[PDB]
Write a protein that binds this DNA or RNA. Sequence first.
DNA 1: GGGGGGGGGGGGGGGGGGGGGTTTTTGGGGGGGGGG
DNA 2: CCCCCCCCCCACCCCCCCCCCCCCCCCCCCCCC
Lengths: 150, 597
Amino acid sequence: VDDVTGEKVREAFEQFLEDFSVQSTDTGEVEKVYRAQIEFMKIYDLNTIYIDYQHLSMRENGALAMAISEQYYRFLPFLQKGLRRVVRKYAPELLNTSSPEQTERVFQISFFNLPTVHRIRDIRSEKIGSLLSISGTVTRTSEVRPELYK
Amino acid sequence: SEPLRIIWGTNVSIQECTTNFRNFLMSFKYKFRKILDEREEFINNTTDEELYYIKQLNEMRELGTSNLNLDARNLLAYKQTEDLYHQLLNYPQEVISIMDQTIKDCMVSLIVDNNLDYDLDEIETKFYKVRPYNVGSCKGMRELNPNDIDKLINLKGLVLRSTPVIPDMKVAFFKCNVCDHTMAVEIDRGVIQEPARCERIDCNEPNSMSLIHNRCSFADKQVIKLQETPDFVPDGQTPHSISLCVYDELVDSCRAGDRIEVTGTFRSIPIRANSRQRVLKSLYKTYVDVVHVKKVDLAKIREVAAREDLYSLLARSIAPSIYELEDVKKGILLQLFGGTNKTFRYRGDINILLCGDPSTSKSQILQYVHKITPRGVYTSGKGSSAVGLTAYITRLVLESGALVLSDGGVCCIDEFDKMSDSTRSVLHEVMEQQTISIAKAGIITTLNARSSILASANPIGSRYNPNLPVTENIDLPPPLLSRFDLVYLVLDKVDEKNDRELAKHLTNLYLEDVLPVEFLTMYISYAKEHIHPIITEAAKTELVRAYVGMRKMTATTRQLESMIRLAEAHAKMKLKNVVELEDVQEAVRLIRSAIKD
DNA sequence: GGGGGGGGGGGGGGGGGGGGGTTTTTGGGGGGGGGG
DNA sequence: CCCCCCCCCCACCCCCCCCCCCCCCCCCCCCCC
Ligand SMILES: [Zn+2]
């Protein structure tokens, strides 16, 4: 069985990622910031894309943004599927770490610029699996370690 | 011919319980409660004919909120529901679930019977809760016994600490490894009802469902430790304590140090000998599973603000039990008002000290301002009776001292002469920068103290000598003494024209029952909330000429800054939004009195 | 043309085996207080 | 005001579990009525 909501989320997000159009303080010719950021990743051989949540919020009546806020943990693999197809279209050099088989590149989808910041005290378990932004002061840190992923 | 839904072990019909509750949750009137309670002649139709719980549900539905408070005596006031009270006490979880469901049904039925349009889908989606309270006598924590093990009880006590919020699973979420089909399973009595085979008959693989932890649905649980209040303890032994479990929007109803009531079902559960075994200990953990918790104007403001004698009126009202020290009272009132802040730091704090003889009214004065101020503290210059002045690292944790705890309030310090030297140094950066610098254990910060200090200090020995300066009488050094805006001397020197009238004023308190002493806090509150004085352009020239005058008479810019802050405080008084020439003049005059010491 | 009997597969139960289950002293550094 | 002291804090049986084996039950196919 396939998650129709997840697949439709992937379709919407993939389209947004490849063709979200804007520019400012410049000519009116649209920059298509995330396609251009994929080019920047291709130049500097990066493996993450930074996404402004408000750009999703204005897109398509914000329905996609609401879905990704409410049920982020469900839809993150679908977002990676959409991102992978866009990277195939506009920067297929990046699908590998880039012969011995240079492995599949993983993509971290680093959201930012959320509507509101929750405090550590505002944690409440309905928000399990949802996207938030959190603030506090870093009182201690771990050693950086390898987590077995695949 | 039909099945019956029964509260198990009781023979109570749930249909009867439901309708007995419904016919009170609607059609109850508050007039009936005064029939039950004392002073029944205070019934009044124009206030008491109200359909009280229809009124509650209407305001509640306009706020869209899930919770209803219910004083349990209101059940006993109403004929069809007095039995429901006993069922509520004796069989609480079933009756409370019935009451919850009935509240939701009342909300649903109102928007189709009273028939105003509303989001039916919103009510359908929402859960609803009753919060019964005042269930009965607040029986002692030490008095509980195994007959209580399922009853709705009431407790009073002191909160020691609470856990962080604990996620409690309400619906497990399962996914099939082979076919990726998903199904939701409600958690029943804390047990996961795992599907042994995949639901889809076209797949039906055994043992293939797996739990997807972060797609389950979780309620909020919190555990709070409640200590027996020392009012109830027998004198020769430790207080007891009870752990209480609290859920959802009742999480963080209280914090450490709160004295509270709780209404809740007394519960007990077994605990294991070791986690790898089912084997249980033969005596259960007890806890209370709470359902309610509780702790322990502008027209007049503008009317009083029109008065001409307001400065003297408010000043005498801060401590009318104390014989005349009126410039001290005026100074402390102006300290209560305070100046203003600015972004760029310069801030609104005003700082005062009292010295002179020890056996005099200064301690009472500190106590009165402590009682008046919203969030101040009382302390003394050294030592710690589990409360101390400076911020301090201890076990590893940083504790905030009385100065830091007095953020936004007056910090009252007695024995300020006998203060320890590390504290004497620490006071400089709160006097100047209103902060204290912390640089330990991987944390570096200027911990902002933001407190006005009222000090009380003493001479060396039993008597102050007024033929010697303040620095010669007092222990604490001049550079710290210089930081205070106003500094005062209170002396026990004999004079019958003062002492007799003081004694008569003091002794008359034992016989007698304008002084707006209880309105003072409200006036201070609204003034601090609403009024932010700015300096008039003419007041610039007034401040400059006054400063150069006292400079021609050893002043420093700290005196000018003090005159600014006092004038701004004087403008919060009378609710004036711009500092006037008279405000500068009184700030100047009071400082001219103080600096002459 | 339907029902019974025989034969084969698949599942469940029972049994057997196996593994797991805090104060007191000593030394050091740092902070605070007292005496010359 | 400086130095020294002294004070504080810190370091073998029983249950759960898993594997293996045997029997029974249920379905399908073939024959008989
Ligand atoms: Zn399946």
